[PDB]
Amino acid sequence: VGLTTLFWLGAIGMLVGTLAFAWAGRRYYVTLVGISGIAAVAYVVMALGVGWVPVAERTVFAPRYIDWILTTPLIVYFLGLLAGLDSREFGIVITLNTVVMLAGFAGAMVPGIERYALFGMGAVAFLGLVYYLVGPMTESASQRSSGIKSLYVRLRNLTVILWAIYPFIWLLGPPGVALLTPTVDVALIVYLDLVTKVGFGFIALDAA
Ligand SMILES: *C/C=C(C)/C=C/C=C(C)/C=C/C1=C(C)CCCC1(C)C
Ligand SMILES: [Cl-]
């Protein structure tokens, strides 16, 4: 099982999700198409061997971080619509999200230990993002129908629990202490990407 095989698997999974969401679809459905559609492209590019950047003694996958930077704010946007956020609360959480994603991208691309300083900053901003999901956004979602509130809580917990695993996979993998091997590290992230995007989406379809 090679890296390319794992990338192709993620590509196929994202594509199936993309077509499923497009068929079922307006704002929510269009967002889900963007979430998995963008990831599909990133995985194909990586499957073709494009964007594998050598850094010191590790290999960094640049399309992964471009993907995350564009798709994770769309996931937060989806959750913000469910919770009924005003346009100002959106700005805070999307700003916090972007800090996490940019810090990870920069830390991965830096060869020296300064990269752990960048990782720490993303961790701090992530804790602030979790606070907004579990607190203010949950208060806000409470004002909606019982079924919408229930859907928000289920997507929120899926999101919080799984997103919290990524920093550990990153740190234990090549970008960090380089303990886990690239193949295992990639396999774990392909699984998480598929669940936090396509699984996320199908839980929404089921409730609709
Ligand atoms: C579809 C892709 C998803 C949901 C990716 C999620 C990624 C994260 C939650 C990553 C978080 C990170 C930290 C909290 C600290 C810095 C390193 C990251 C980017 C792995
Ligand atoms: Cl990476």
Q: 89-127: buried (b, 16+ CB within 10 Å) or exposed (e) per residue?
A: beeebbebbebbbbbbbbbbebeeeebeebbebbeebbe
By most ligand atoms within 8 Å of CB, the mutation choice from 66, 126, 193, 198 for ligand 1 is 126
Please state, in angstroms and rounded to a whole number, the distance separating the CA atoms of residues 120 and 167: 10
Confirm if 135 and 92 have CB atoms less than 8 A apart: no
Ligand 1 binding residues, C-beta < 6 A? 39, 68, 71-72, 100-101, 103-104, 119, 122-123, 126, 163, 166-167, 170, 193, 196-197
Other beta carbons within 10 Å of 63: 21
146 belongs to a structural domain: yes
Q: Would 11 be classed as within a structural domain?
A: no
Residue partners of 115: CB distance under 8 A and separation at least 6: 106, 107, 108, 175
Determine the residue type at 106. Answer: A
Which residues 6+ apart lie within 8 Å of 27 measured at CB? Answer: 81
Give the chain's domain count. 1
Return d(Cα 111, Cα 134) in angstroms, integer: 35
For residue 55, give the 3-state DSSP assignment.
Answer: strand
Q: Can you tell me the distance from the alpha carbon of 90 to that of 80, in angstroms, rounded to the nearest whole number?
A: 7
Q: Domain of 80?
A: 52-207
| CB contact at 8 A, 139 and 80 | no
Q: From residue 51, how far is each of 2, 64, 72 by CA, in Å? A: 17, 9, 20
Q: Which two tokens stand for residue 191?
A: 């699984």
Experimentally, the structure was elucidated by X-ray
* Residue at 43 is within a domain: no
Q: Which long-range contacts (CB under 8 A, 24 or more apart) does 185-189 make?
A: 186/3, 186/6, 186/7, 186/61, 187/1, 187/6, 189/64
**What CATH number should be reported for the domain holding residue 171?**
1.20.1070.10
Q: Is residue 108 part of a domain?
A: yes
Phi and psi at 48, nearest 5°, equal -75, 0
Q: Looking at ligand 1, which residue's alpha carbon is closest to its atom 10?
A: 166
Which ligand 1 atom is the nearest neighbour of the CA of 197?
1
